[PDB]
Amino acid sequence: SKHQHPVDNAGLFSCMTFSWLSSLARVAHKKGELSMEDVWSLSKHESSDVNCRRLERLWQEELNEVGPDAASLRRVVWIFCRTRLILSIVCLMITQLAGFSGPAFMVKHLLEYTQATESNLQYSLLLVLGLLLTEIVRSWSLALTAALNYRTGVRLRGAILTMAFKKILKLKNIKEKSLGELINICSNDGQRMAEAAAVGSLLAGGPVVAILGMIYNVIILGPTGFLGSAVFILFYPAMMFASRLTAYFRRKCVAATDERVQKMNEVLTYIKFIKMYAWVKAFSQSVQKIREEERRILEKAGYFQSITVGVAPIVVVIASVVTFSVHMTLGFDLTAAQAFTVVTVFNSMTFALKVTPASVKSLSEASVAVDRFKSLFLMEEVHMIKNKPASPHIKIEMKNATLAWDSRLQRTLHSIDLEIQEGKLVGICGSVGSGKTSLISAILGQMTLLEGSIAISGTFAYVAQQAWILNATLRDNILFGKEYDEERYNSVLNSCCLRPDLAILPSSDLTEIGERGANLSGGQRQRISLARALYSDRSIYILDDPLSALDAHVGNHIFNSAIRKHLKSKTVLFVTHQLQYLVDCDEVIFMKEGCITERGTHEELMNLNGDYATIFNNLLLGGSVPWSVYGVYIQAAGGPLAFLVIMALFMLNVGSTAFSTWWLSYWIKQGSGNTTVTRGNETSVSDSMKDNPHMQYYASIYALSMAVMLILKAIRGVVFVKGTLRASSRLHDELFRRILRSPMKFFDTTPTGRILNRFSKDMDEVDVRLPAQAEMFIQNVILVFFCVGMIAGVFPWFLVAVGPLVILFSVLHIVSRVLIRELKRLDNITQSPFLSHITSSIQGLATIHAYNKGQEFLHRYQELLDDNQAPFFLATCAMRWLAVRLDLISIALITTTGLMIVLMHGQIPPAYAGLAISYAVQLTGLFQATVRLASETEARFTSVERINHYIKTKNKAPSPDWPQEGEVTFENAEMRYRENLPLVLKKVSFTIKPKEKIGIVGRTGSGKSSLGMALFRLVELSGGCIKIDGVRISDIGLADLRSKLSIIPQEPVLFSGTVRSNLDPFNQYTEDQIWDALERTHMKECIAQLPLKLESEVMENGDNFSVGERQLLCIARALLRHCKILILDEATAAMDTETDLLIQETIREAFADCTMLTIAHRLHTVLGSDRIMVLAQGQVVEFDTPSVLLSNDSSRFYAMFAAAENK
């Protein structure tokens, strides 16, 4: 025994057969759920610390030997992994030698014995035992070499991830890389390296058995054997070519699918505007046009992908046909054993296309990860000041320090003579870019030194800008790895006045805040950072501006409560940006261009009449998938007929190869037509296929069988893709149709992102991932069924031997895959906390570096890495554990087939026995693929299930001229937003009459926002009646209702595409009317100067236009329709001193001859209206015209107007 982990306790046989996992497999099967407690802890050999130390030692050794610039991290990886890679390579060599010598020798000798006229029992038994032993030791050696590299990949990932984390923690240039790269390299590069070391180490595998096969087939045959090798070496860079073509088709049309996702997001977020404008048909047409363009390249991508999914038997059949059709017709002889040895070795070399491309892609990923890690390891490292001042009273000492920045020595500071003393309240103020932040960073230690010296005699309590903080509960953010003291905690809370924050928070001390703060604000974040700094109890406090945008009153209160009183015995480096915080400061310094100009306390600062005094004066002045899915999936695919057609086509595709093999066996068995050939003085029939009179007929039938197989494969490839894509298209169309027609309440309750997830992730998965795995699963299942049926046909006793084996396979399947699903779930729910403490760590590094808490952070990161890697290691080992048990069935089937062949010697033709053993040795590696494909399809069906259930859960004839007038009346309308919700409309009744300027305004939540969509009938009326032009709103069609109405929302909304498309999506309005509307809204010149003349294209939300132009575009909208009732919402504050007035001028100039149901929350912009109503809590209380309402002081509206004037 070496460790508590059963992996170390396992010897040779247990490790080879993965017997250690059958102590957790049983408990997982019995309980049905695997938790982190049941998962064994990581071994000390695979522990992060030891492997990281070894990797660092090797890296430093190579850096010292070769050089910082000429070193290679690939050499470091090779040196680290050589010990566990050499033995794995040897094991792969021996297992691939056994797997090649099995069919080449054991099958050939067995078939030669079958053709022999004698009958030997001991020899046949010895041959069967030898073949069984060879296959058993091949499978076991493969399992051993997989387990050997699985551990070293995990240990390499663990060693490199912590080293990368330490490097990014100790780097100086935080902004050198991006946010999405530092997190990716510490979370995905390690996994890429692990999977590379796991699967790509077999690069010396498939190729070596392939070249061994090429060397073979030339001794038994003649020169014809080179044609079989040429066929393989031309077919490989054809499946590779198809894979490259499908990869090129991928990452293409991704722009189209991103445009579709953006359009769906725009139609979901701005669904109120579209539903209030009847712009549904045009948007639906737009998305249909985008989708049909997407599934025009998606169809080709699927066509090219479906070629290389099941090529395992097709390549062997093609090579055999090409070899035999020219070997027989050239006069050469061919026997059953001679012909079937080539087929068996071709099937053996077939076990390269499944692994080699994956190995190459893993090696490429490992190489690019190594290059990126090397680039990470070559940047400058941050430094910490260790020199101390000669006088202990001096805290920070620096004399004539250049202290250049980086870009590299970027000169920013010049001749700084700081003499900071212990216990001071100084402040370094200056212009932006003069070197204030540069000086702060230099004090922290992230600055290089050229001339002078830097002396620090204490730790830094530095708070960073933007308040990065941590990503945990609001208790460790204040302690920051310190002992919890009640008195200190209460003092810190009282100093920073955090009691109201705790009171308003739901969980108070237990409240959880994200990396940036979800239920938090900038001021609260800064207060939390200040509290953490106060509780830190350090010597020097590097106080970066905490109150730049926090507040004034409470900011001064916390400043004079904590910085002045609590922070008296500690050094203060408070940056200052307002200049009233240094009235009590001990020494005020003002530095410009990196040089100190004024020193001393404040009194000298004003009496010297410097720049600081001028600035101060200026500032003072200023799961299981049910059967419903499978069924509906196929029902959406076209019903039972489509599934039956697909199944029949797959069976025909497999049966093409099956019939080719059967015809080859028939040609071998038929002999020379039972004719006699004169070989001299003896004439006694013949036993050579070359003497068969109908040899050309057999060759032609073989060639036709190959052609038919190719045609069937092409037909399946071009049909199955269409069948699996039409289902996705129909599902997407139905989902869009039901979502667009669904009440708005579905949008208010269900989040927009949740709906969008069904069109960006679920839809893409359904389109590209699930059909790909389903095709291979179906192909493997049909191939296995056909092989089993044909094997049983030759010997009518395979069913009785396979029945118990089928039961064993079913028992294995039900026992397993549960510890796989649970292990994957555990890996995900341990990697999510691994993304925690990583995204936060990269987001904020200056605070960590200044506080010197880089050791406990690294320890926590290593602990998280180990607790995430252990489930990953177990999950990786589970695949090989299942593969061993499935091989225990595969080799058993092969042994049973061989025993049946040897027992029935003389009653079975050699070709029939040979085909059986060829298919038996072809059965290898099929159950392992089949179960994995079934599990993957079951997992992928969760997306289809999530998509599903979403589609599950006249009277009055309007006049052609309606509305002739703009008369609006309300008859005690009763309305509510949703059921079981507080009422928003309470017996509201009023009269508008055409030609009005209603200036509706009320308190928040009173019901002002309800009006608008209330008139448009976004949700059905719960009571009351509303009449337009004497006609009730109800009992009218949706288009008729929301087609003669217009409204401009609060925030301008613009759709991506074309300006013409935004102005006229239906394309039925004349250009002259559009230009007249633009002229009336004052657009003309500034929009006519565009190079494309209004076809200039608009980005998302109109990001290429100014805010004023964005508002003016929406103002110009609804002018073309010349609608009567306008329900223009709030203008979202005033824009400048002229743009707002111009907008108002255009607004009243355009909509002058019609009603004006404008809603504005500003009392200054509502003045001059013809008549204004005031609605409070859903009741009308004031209808008497602003003017008349004004004279009356008792009216509320006058009180609000006076309050607004006062404020």
Residue numbers in the entry: 95 to 501, 573 to 787, 839 to 1169, 1179 to 1432
Provide the authors' original text about this structure.
To uncover the mechanism of hMRP5, we determine six distinct cryo-EM structures, revealing an autoinhibitory N-terminal peptide that must dissociate to permit subsequent substrate recruitment. Human MRP5 was demonstrated to play a critical function in regulating cellular cyclic GMP (cGMP) homeostasis, which is essential for many physiological processes, including the maintenance of vascular smooth muscle tone and cardiac contractility. hMRP5 also influences signaling transduction pathways and may contribute to drug resistance in anticancer and antivirus therapy. From a clinical oncology perspective, hMRP5 can directly contribute to cancer drug resistance through the efflux of many anticancer drugs, such as methotrexate, cisplatin, purine analogs, pyrimidine analogs, doxorubicin, and antifolates from cells.
To validate these hydrophobic interactions, we generated an hMRP5 mutant with six binding pocket mutations - Trp240A, Phe288A, Phe452A, Phe988A, Phe1091A, and Phe1145A - denoted as hMRP5-m6. High-resolution cryo-EM structure of hMRP5-m6 revealed a similar overall conformation to the wt-hMRP5 and hMRP5-Δ1-94, with separated NBDs. However, the C46-S64-derived EM density was absent in the hMRP5-m6 binding pocket, confirming the importance of hydrophobic residues in anchoring the C46-S64 peptide.
